[PDB]
Amino acid sequence: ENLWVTVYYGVPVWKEAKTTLFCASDARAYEKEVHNVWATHACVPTDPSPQELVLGNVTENFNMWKNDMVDQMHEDIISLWDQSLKPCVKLTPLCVTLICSDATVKTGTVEEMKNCSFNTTTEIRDKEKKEYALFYKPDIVPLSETNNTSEYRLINCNTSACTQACPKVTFEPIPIHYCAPAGYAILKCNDETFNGTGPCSNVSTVQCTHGIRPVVSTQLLLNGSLAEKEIVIRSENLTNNAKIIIVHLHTPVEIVCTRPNNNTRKSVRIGPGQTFYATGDIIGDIKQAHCNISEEKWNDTLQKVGIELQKHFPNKTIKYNQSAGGDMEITTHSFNCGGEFFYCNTSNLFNGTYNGTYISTNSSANSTSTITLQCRIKQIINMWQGVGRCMYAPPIAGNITCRSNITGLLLTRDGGTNSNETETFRPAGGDMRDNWRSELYKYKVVKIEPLGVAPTRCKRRV
Amino acid sequence: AVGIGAVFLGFLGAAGSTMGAASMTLTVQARNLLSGTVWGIKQLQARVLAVERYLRDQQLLGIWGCSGKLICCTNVPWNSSWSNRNLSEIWDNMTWLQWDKEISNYTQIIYGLLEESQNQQEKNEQDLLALD
Amino acid sequence: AVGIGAVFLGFLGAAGSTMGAASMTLTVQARNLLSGTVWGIKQLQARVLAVERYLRDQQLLGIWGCSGKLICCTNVPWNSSWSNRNLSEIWDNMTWLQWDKEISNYTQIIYGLLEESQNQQEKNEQDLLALD
Amino acid sequence: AVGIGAVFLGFLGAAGSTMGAASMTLTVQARNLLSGTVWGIKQLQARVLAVERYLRDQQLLGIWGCSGKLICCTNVPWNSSWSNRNLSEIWDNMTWLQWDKEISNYTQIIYGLLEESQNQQEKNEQDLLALD
Ligand SMILES: *[C@@H]1O[C@H](CO)[C@@H](O[C@@H]2O[C@H](CO)[C@@H](O[C@@H]3O[C@H](CO[C@H]4O[C@H](CO)[C@@H](O)[C@H](O)[C@@H]4O)[C@@H](O)[C@H](O)[C@@H]3O)[C@H](O)[C@H]2NC(C)=O)[C@H](O)[C@H]1NC(C)=O
Ligand SMILES: *[C@@H]1O[C@H](CO)[C@@H](O[C@@H]2O[C@H](CO)[C@@H](O)[C@H](O)[C@H]2NC(C)=O)[C@H](O)[C@H]1NC(C)=O
Ligand SMILES: *[C@@H]1O[C@H](CO)[C@@H](O[C@@H]2O[C@H](CO)[C@@H](O)[C@H](O)[C@H]2NC(C)=O)[C@H](O)[C@H]1NC(C)=O
Ligand SMILES: *[C@@H]1O[C@H](CO)[C@@H](O[C@@H]2O[C@H](CO)[C@@H](O)[C@H](O)[C@H]2NC(C)=O)[C@H](O)[C@H]1NC(C)=O
Ligand SMILES: *[C@@H]1O[C@H](CO)[C@@H](O)[C@H](O)[C@H]1NC(C)=O
Ligand SMILES: *[C@@H]1O[C@H](CO)[C@@H](O)[C@H](O)[C@H]1NC(C)=O
Ligand SMILES: *[C@@H]1O[C@H](CO)[C@@H](O)[C@H](O)[C@H]1NC(C)=O
Numbered sequence: 134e135n136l137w138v139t140v141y142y143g144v145p146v147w148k149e150a151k152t153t154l155f156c157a158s159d160a161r162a163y164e165k166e167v168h169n170v171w172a173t174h175a176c177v178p179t180d181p182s183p184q185e186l187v188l189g190n191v192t193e194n195f196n197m198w199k200n201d202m203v204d205q206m207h208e209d210i211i212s213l214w215d216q217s218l219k220p221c222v223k224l225t226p227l228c229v230t231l232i233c234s235d236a237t238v239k240t241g242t243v244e245e246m247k248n249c250s251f252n253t254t255t256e257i258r259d260k261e262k263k264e265y266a267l268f269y270k271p272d273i274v275p276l277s278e279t280n281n282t283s284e285y286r287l288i289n290c291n292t293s294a295c296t297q298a299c300p301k302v303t304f305e306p307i308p309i310h311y312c313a314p315a316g317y318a319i320l321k322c323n324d325e326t327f328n329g330t331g332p333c334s335n336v337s338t339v340q341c342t343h344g345i346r347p348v349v350s351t352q353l354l355l356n357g358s359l360a361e362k363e364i365v366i367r368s369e370n371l372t373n374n375a376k377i378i379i380v381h382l383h384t385p386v387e388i389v390c391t392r393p394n395n396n397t398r399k400s401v402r403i404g405p406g407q408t409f410y411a412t413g414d415i416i417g418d419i420k421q422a423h424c425n426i427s428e429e430k431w432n433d434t435l436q437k438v439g440i441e442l443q444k445h446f447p448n449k450t451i452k453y454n455q456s457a458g459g460d461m462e463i464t465t466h467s468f469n470c471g472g473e474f475f476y477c478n479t480s481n482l483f484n485g486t487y488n489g490t491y492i493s494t495n496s497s498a499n500s501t502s503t504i505t506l507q508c509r510i511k512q513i514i515n516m517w518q519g520v521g522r523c524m525y526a527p528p529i530a531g532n533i534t535c536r537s538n539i540t541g542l543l544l545t546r547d548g549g550t551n552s553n554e555t556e557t558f559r560p561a562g563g564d565m566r567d568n569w570r571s572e573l574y575k576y577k578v579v580k581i582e583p584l585g586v587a588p589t590r591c592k593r594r595v
Numbered sequence: 596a597v598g599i600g601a602v603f604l605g606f607l608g609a610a611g612s613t614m615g616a617a618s619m620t621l622t623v624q625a626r627n628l629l630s631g632t633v634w635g636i637k638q639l640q641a642r643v644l645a646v647e648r649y650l651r652d653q654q655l656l657g658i659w660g661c662s663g664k665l666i667c668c669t670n671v672p673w674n675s676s677w678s679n680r681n682l683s684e685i686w687d688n689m690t691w692l693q694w695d696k697e698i699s700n701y702t703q704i705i706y707g708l709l710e711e712s713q714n715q716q717e718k719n720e721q722d723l724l725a726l727d
Numbered sequence: 728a729v730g731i732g733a734v735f736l737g738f739l740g741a742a743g744s745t746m747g748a749a750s751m752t753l754t755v756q757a758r759n760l761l762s763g764t765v766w767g768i769k770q771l772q773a774r775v776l777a778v779e780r781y782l783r784d785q786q787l788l789g790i791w792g793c794s795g796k797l798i799c800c801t802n803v804p805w806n807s808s809w810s811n812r813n814l815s816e817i818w819d820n821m822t823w824l825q826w827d828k829e830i831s832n833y834t835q836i837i838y839g840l841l842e843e844s845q846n847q848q849e850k851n852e853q854d855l856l857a858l859d
Numbered sequence: 860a861v862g863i864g865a866v867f868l869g870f871l872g873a874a875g876s877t878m879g880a881a882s883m884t885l886t887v888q889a890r891n892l893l894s895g896t897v898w899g900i901k902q903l904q905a906r907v908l909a910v911e912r913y914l915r916d917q918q919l920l921g922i923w924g925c926s927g928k929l930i931c932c933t934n935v936p937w938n939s940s941w942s943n944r945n946l947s948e949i950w951d952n953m954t955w956l957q958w959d960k961e962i963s964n965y966t967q968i969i970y971g972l973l974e975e976s977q978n979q980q981e982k983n984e985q986d987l988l989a990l991d
């Protein structure tokens with residue numbers, strides 16, 4: 134016998150590569166709404182149905198934290214947000230001296246709203262008209278050089294002029310499918326209860342992911358896909374306290390949130406052909422913005438997350454605790470329900486300590502025990518900590534109500550010489566990346582790399 | 596796993612089968628290598644790389660022989676230092692992805708041999724056609 | 728109408744001639760399927776679609792046989808359920824455009840038959856070159 | 860000057876060698892013809908032209924024959940009005956560039972001979988396979 138090279142095209146072999154993926158919609162938005170829906174106008178109208186191909190005897194080395202595709206989501210998000218703001222009204226003329234008083238004096242539930250008035254430039258450049266609006270105290274700051282008077286300004290005039298978000302734009306988290314371009318493929322695990330790193334034993338190709346909602350939030354996730362069979366705990370490295378812990382849930386705890394007081398919207402003309410929108414009045418009662426969770430189901434979830442998290446810290450008792458301190462954007466859970474940017478105090482929610490007994494203290498009888506959170510609202514948001522990314526959200530008339538399944542908790546550990554029997558887990562001020570990474574952990578992209586060469590014992594015709 | 600309608604239409608779907616059994620599916624990969632504001636530049640750049648990837652492969656296949664044949668013999672003997680397996684391990688035991696871990700060493704030696712085999716053959720055929 | 732300098736250089740100029748007499752003009756079409764600020768994006772998308780149109784045909788002809796031949800035979804017998812006509816009607820009465828109205832039914836039956844016809848040829852040649 | 864690892868990787872490097880000697884090097888040119896904000900339009904336009912150039916060359920070579928052969932004979936005799944030299948000057952004395960200064964006149968006469976030469980062959984082959 135003797136052996137001769139043969140060249141084979143089309144053979145199935147592959148390599149890791151970084152490549153620009155492209156976004157594919159469910160096409161439902163592609164009426165007028167394609168250009169109204171933030172996180173859809175960049176994407177193809179498609180039926181991107183995830184394909185059927187379990188790969189058989191393959192084993193593949195996935196990774197959740199070293200992954201690149203999360204940074205493609207992050208750059209695509211920022212570049213699309215910033216694109217959608219360019220045509221909209223800059224608030225530059227509105228950096229005037231505001232003169233203010235309280236809406237009805239009294240408790241913080243109503244004194245949250247300042248009533249403020251100012252001169253506005255009409256269409257007629259030489260004429261200014263006196264005008265008024267209601268503002269939430271976080272949007273406002275006292276003007277200095279004065280004896281503690283009624284003189285105020287918008288919070289942002291010393292940093293950047295925000296655009297009003299165009300009122301046709303809708304921030305609703307319509308799902309994105311991410312797709313591989315031609316000559317690349319996406320692999321996923323089917324081997325659930327996966328650990329975020331190491332070999333995955335049951336693997337499929339798909340050209341496009343399932344529908345991923347681009348939900349931004351902190352301290353909790355919302356409308357995330359649930360884990361398959363059990364609570365899954367993931368971290369880049371638990372032994373470094375600086376690593377986040379994604380506590381991915383098996384079962385949906387449910388949250389309800391509301392601004393129950395009844396706002397009305399007024400439009401203020403500013404120069405030729407632009408309207409600022411402001412809260413004109415509160416109709417009837419002043420009752421506070423708040424969120425409700427069934428404290429029974431939440432308490433079972435803090436037992437079960439106690440049980441699982443103890444496997445990595447065996448025998449030790451678990452303290453939950455509040456966040457350590459800072460701005461609202463760091464210390465409070467956050468949303469965009471209806472189009473309003475809530476900021477809810479989680480301090481009473483992550484309360485108490487629970488231990489290796491993990492008894493079913495919730496009895497099988499009926500109970501209506503609700504935990505409730507106090508929530509601030511803001512209109513000026515310095516989005517994703519960008520001073521130039523900032524926007525003013527126009528107010529929404531009527532009263533907001535909003536319901537959701539919840540989370541994969543973004544915890545951080547806190548522990549040292551104090552510990553002995555016990556350690557503290559606190560809500561964490563997550564990056565945007567951490568949300569999306571709790572959906573994309575399943576997925577890896579490869580370059581197909583055909584043109585294989587092998588010995589076959591055959592010889593050319595001459 | 597394997598079905599000739601779709602196995603390589605999401606690419607890759609035969610890769611567990613061992614090298615001899617995979618060789619009946621190659622067409623499904625080949626026919627799938629070429630499917631289809633700043634996002635306009637993203638799609639154009641993605642498309643144009645997928646074309647150049649395909650043409651640079653078809654050009655290498657042209658220059659070595661064979662011009663479009665998916666499978667062909669080459670008149671380059673298989674060197675003793677590469678010969679570390681009996682043929683039946685290659686065709687009947689290994690997967691294509693596993694075999695790549697071996698022959699991903701020293702590959703461009705084979706491409707240099709393959710190119711020059713074709714030069715000498717075209718020189719020889721040209722004299723036969725000159726007599727003919 | 729017909730003229731091999733220009734008939735398909737603005738395309739289609741033979742379309743009424745009947746199927747047999749059109750067969751002499753195909754080169755004029757084959758040589759022309761690849762002739763050549765937001766307007767820059769319109770032109771780049773026009774160009775790259777015309778390339779992908781062309782290469783996808785060359786990939787199909789490459790897979791069924793024949794690699795660049797304009798005309799060839801294929802070892803798929805013509806089924807009675809398609810055989811509704813005598814050869815003289817086809818080559819001497821219908822136009823290519825009239826013919827399309829029939830065989831635009833069931834076309835992917837034919838492409839399944841053609842691709843597998845080639846696989847079995849390449850397998851059978853591989854054994855003979857292994858014995859050679 | 861000549862060296863098969865780089866001579867045409869910066870292109871052109873055999874251009875002084877005479878036509879007979881340069882003929883061993885052609886592969887290095889072919890394998891390099893397809894290497895790889897408003898500047899993105901400038902790069903896409905450069906790429907897309909490099910692709911269509913390369914494909915229009917392969918399209919001609921297909922239509923005349925030969926679809927991937929780098930060198931082939933063509934059954935068009937060399938007319939006396941172009942035969943202004945002995946073969947030994949052409950292959951052993953001129954450079955390819957100095958030869959181009961001649962047959963850059965009237966080249967399209969030769970393309971009309973080459974294209975039509977292939978038609979008559981493919982018709983003739985179809986009549987033989989029509990008895991195979
Ligand atoms: C988690 O998932 C939950 C289930 O999908 C989310 O709850 C849903 O939230 C949306 C938020 O908009 C509610 O949709 C509504 O849409 C109608 C019609 O909208 C159109 O008209 C309005 C003017 O009224 C216009 O501004 C829009 O541009 C549209 O053209 C509105 O009239 C309603 O007020 C309402 O906002 C769903 O009703 C709501 N479903 C449930 C069961 O609550 C939840 O928001 C997700 N969580 C997070 C944090 O996003
Ligand atoms: C919330 O405020 C709106 C705006 O004032 C109220 O809508 C008005 O309700 C009255 C009584 O039903 C109607 O006569 C008006 O025609 C309504 N429209 C407007 C534009 O004024 C609404 O009733 C309030 N709802 C609650 C529950 O407070
Ligand atoms: C939750 O975290 C806070 C802040 O780290 C803890 O609060 C401190 O508790 C000690 C108890 O001796 C006090 O001396 C400190 O003054 C507290 N505040 C600060 C800023 O350190 C709190 O103990 C933790 N909760 C539980 C129940 O352990
Ligand atoms: C605006 O507020 C009203 C009154 O709170 C909401 O209607 C009620 O919803 C709550 C929670 O489901 C119920 O407890 C009340 O009994 C309902 N009251 C009535 C009169 O129906 C209403 O859903 C809110 N509107 C929007 C658009 O969210
Ligand atoms: C806000 O202040 C203006 C001052 O002109 C007054 O007319 C208006 O009634 C006030 N509105 C509320 C709801 O306080
Ligand atoms: C803008 O003004 C507020 C006034 O309270 C101040 O806190 C903030 O530090 C200022 N920022 C800059 C960049 O001047
Ligand atoms: C599981 O995940 C952790 C955290 O990413 C990693 O450090 C560890 O090595 C993994 N262990 C196994 C058995 O996969």
Ligand SMILES: *[C@@H]1O[C@H](CO)[C@@H](O)[C@H](O)[C@H]1NC(C)=O
Pocket residue numbers: 447448
């Ligand atoms: C954990 O507790 C069990 C039961 O009390 C005991 O046997 C074991 O030694 C303990 N392990 C550690 C690491 O403390």
Ligand SMILES: *[C@@H]1O[C@H](CO)[C@@H](O)[C@H](O)[C@H]1NC(C)=O
Pocket residue numbers: 464465478479480481
């Ligand atoms: C949350 O509420 C507690 C009282 O329940 C209060 O002391 C604390 O300041 C609040 N924290 C934040 C961050 O809002």
Ligand SMILES: *[C@@H]1O[C@H](CO)[C@@H](O)[C@H](O)[C@H]1NC(C)=O
Pocket residue numbers: 356385536537538
């Ligand atoms: C919450 O989860 C349950 C799981 O069965 C599902 O039926 C329900 O539709 C989900 N609701 C939302 C708003 O996601």
